[PDB]
Amino acid sequence: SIELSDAVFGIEPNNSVLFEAINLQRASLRQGTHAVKNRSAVSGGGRKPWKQKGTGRARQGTIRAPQWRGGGIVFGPTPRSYAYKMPKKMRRLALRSALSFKVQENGLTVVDAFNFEAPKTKEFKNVLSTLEQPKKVLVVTENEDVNVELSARNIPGVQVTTAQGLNVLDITNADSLVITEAAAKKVEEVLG
Amino acid sequence: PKMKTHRGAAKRVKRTASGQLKRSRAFTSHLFANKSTKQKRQLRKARLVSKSDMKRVKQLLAYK
Amino acid sequence: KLHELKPAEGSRKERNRVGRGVATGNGKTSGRGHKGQKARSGGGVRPGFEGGQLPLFRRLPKRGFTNINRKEYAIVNLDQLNKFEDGTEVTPALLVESGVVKNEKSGIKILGNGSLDKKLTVKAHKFSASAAEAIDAKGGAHEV
Amino acid sequence: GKQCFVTGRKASTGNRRSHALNSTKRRWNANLQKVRILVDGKPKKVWVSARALKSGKVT
RNA sequence: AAGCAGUAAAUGUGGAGCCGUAGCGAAAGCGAGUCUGAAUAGGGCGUUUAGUAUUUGGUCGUAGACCCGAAACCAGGUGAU
RNA sequence: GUAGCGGCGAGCGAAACGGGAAGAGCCCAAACCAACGUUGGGGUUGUAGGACACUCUAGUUACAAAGGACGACAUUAGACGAAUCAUCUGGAAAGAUGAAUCAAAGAAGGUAAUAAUCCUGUAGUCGAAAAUGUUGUCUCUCUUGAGUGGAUCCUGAGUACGACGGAGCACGUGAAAUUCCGUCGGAAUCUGGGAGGACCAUCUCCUAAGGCUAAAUACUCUCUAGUGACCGAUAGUGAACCAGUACCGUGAGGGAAAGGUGAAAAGCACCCCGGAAGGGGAGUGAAAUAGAACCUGAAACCGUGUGCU
């Protein structure tokens, strides 16, 4: 019901490392897929509109220049990536800081197990009412459980994952944390 | 791509332990009958790149 | 807490933009000067260019050569041997897995920049004239 | 249709070098000669190289 | 690092590899010392010796490289209404 | 960006080890044994092979020789598919205010306004006359492997290589090995021949002058599903409109401008002025300063009236 470790759930959250961790996971989710045409990519515009001298017009060299209507982009978007790396030790510390931040708010509850024989969403919703949880809840499990994930994915604000598939975005987003008794010990040895 | 090293400059200097560069001397190829004995003897010693020339060729030797 | 994020103090700064008004100080000219080669788009002279005078590297002569059969060794002073047990046997195979030698280039050479503080038996390829003087003075015996 | 009948020797291309090392494209032709050789139906006039005609042959 | 397993998640594995802990000499080589020299006689460069990974900002290098503008050069084609 | 190359200037620029993806290897010429320049056997190489003398009960047409008969999954139309009723403001409810519901379905798009329960769909679960593709089975064809001696025999020639003139290897003829083309001269034969960066000796590792071979790699006209801290009508493909079309040139070629009434045409029956165009009433609609030169309607610019001057 209430057991502590003080080394994976009791440390003081390092907020300076938590910021970079959340910012790093938000940049890897975006695909660029944007581009524009330039002087050479636009269609046509090979000849010169008129000669250099012999009239009161401004000198030009092509009808697809930047200052022309409908021709040429100077510096636009290009297809690129936004992901970057971070030392391994800094990754584990940013994760232990999120788990401890929750226990500091009385937001961690350990349950016995799940005996869902078949997928029923209403039965899972009644379970969350007995524990008196907030509107957004993150459920953790030792290993994949199709019924536990099936009967819960449809409820709004409810997310279900595994012990080894946790990240700082889900822990920070969830208002409460619900983790199984046995699964809790597994997450302990992994974080060390 | 990575920057390329000035191969001509890598054949004339070496990097010391404190970040300096050791070089050779000039007026040492020929015409020794026009120079004094003291002048030629003291030219066999090495020197270091001056503080003004380092500001111009810093990146030229960034990999040495 | 995603609606209250706060970065560290002094870890982020905003980029400078030139050519966006006079109140910034980097407007029309943007910081290039007036009617020069360094003010044109495309760059200027190369790093080592001296404007026409002979470059320093051309003035200086070449020196030396390189050896194809250059052998290098990983030095280990008598100061890094204060962690093993008294009388233990130290071998290159151990030094590369204990944490003292990260990469054995062409063998381990033991130098004498310090005191041993223990009695050990060392096995290496080369010993400094002063490394063996102090290894055999604290007991034990070295070997190649 | 300019190549040896007994082999595949033909011409190639190269460079012409001067004292100053200037380059100019040129050709390297083969030593072709008209000869009448035995063919299964009857003899004919073909182009045969001088290298193949060495050491003896039938004509 | 590539790769492998993962939601195009960015986590877990992966220690070939790179930098640092020791310099000096063209080199053999020696080593908290080394080079020059008959000579630690003197002098030169070292023993000052904290580093390393990721990232915001400034500047430089290779790419058109802050934007617009030539007189020309070469290649393949179209034209004696 | 190391070795090295370079009017050693500007500049150019390796490989082998080590870590990975993938991963099988075979068929001929020759010696020889039988037939009158069809291929019939025999045989394929370095911890030396074969001919020649000698012990003697699986493979599959993607290389390795190739021609078919035989069961199951997918592709090209579809089908079924849970759960809502009132009140207030509206021209209209999905909004607000109350009470009920389904979820392995709260992805989306429509519907007179902002819908999990109104509509088409989604989760999930089913379906194929006939025609393609991928395969699995037996069928079908084709199929003798270890060979201890070892004197005599066999391998691929105007080739290997050298000189001269060129090119190519990171390497500009340089001390330039290794690889190619043209012209001439021209080797050896298992006690042989080639390489290890000129060249010689020793040692070590290989066996040229015949051929074939899947997988790990590159690319996208055009398909079927999807995705975006990408564009939103001077933007995005030149082209959201029937655009390579108006137009220009003898020709090869060059090349635009042009989206929006309303929820629903419900697109103003009828009267009046006028030759018409246009307009004033009436009527439609929530709104006609929403009447097709039709959402919103900025500035330049052009008019009328007026307080002070």
UniProtKB/TrEMBL annotation, chain B:
Spans annotated as Disordered: 1-48
Extent of Basic residues compositional bias: 1-15, 37-48
Keywords: Ribonucleoprotein, Ribosomal protein
GO cellular component: cytosolic large ribosomal subunit
Gene Ontology annotations of biological process type: translation
PROSITE patterns xrefs: RIBOSOMAL_L35
GO molecular function, one term: structural constituent of ribosome
Gene3D superfamilies the UniProt entry points to: 4.10.410.60
Homology family: Belongs to the bacterial ribosomal protein bL35 family.
Protein name per the record: Large ribosomal subunit protein bL35
Source species: Staphylococcus schweitzeri
UniProt gene name: rpmI
UniProtKB/TrEMBL annotation, chain C:
Biased composition (Gly residues): 41-51
Ranges of Basic and acidic residues composition bias in the record: 1-17
Highest rank taxon of the organism: Bacteria
UniProt-listed PROSITE patterns: RIBOSOMAL_L15
Location of the Large ribosomal subunit protein uL15/eL18 domain: 75-141
Subunit structure: Part of the 50S ribosomal subunit.
Described function: Binds to the 23S rRNA.
Protein name: Large ribosomal subunit protein uL15
Taxonomic lineage: Bacteria, Bacillati, Bacillota, Bacilli, Bacillales
Automatic annotation (TrEMBL), chain D:
GO cellular component: ribonucleoprotein complex; ribosome
One Gene Ontology MF term: structural constituent of ribosome
UniProt keyword annotations, A-Z: Ribonucleoprotein, Ribosomal protein
One Pfam family linked to the record: Ribosomal_L28
Region Disordered: start-end pairs: 1-21
BP-aspect Gene Ontology terms: translation
Biological source species: Staphylococcus schweitzeri
The organism's taxonomic lineage, starting at the top: Bacteria, Bacillati, Bacillota, Bacilli, Bacillales
Protein name: Large ribosomal subunit protein bL28
Family from the record: Belongs to the bacterial ribosomal protein bL28 family.
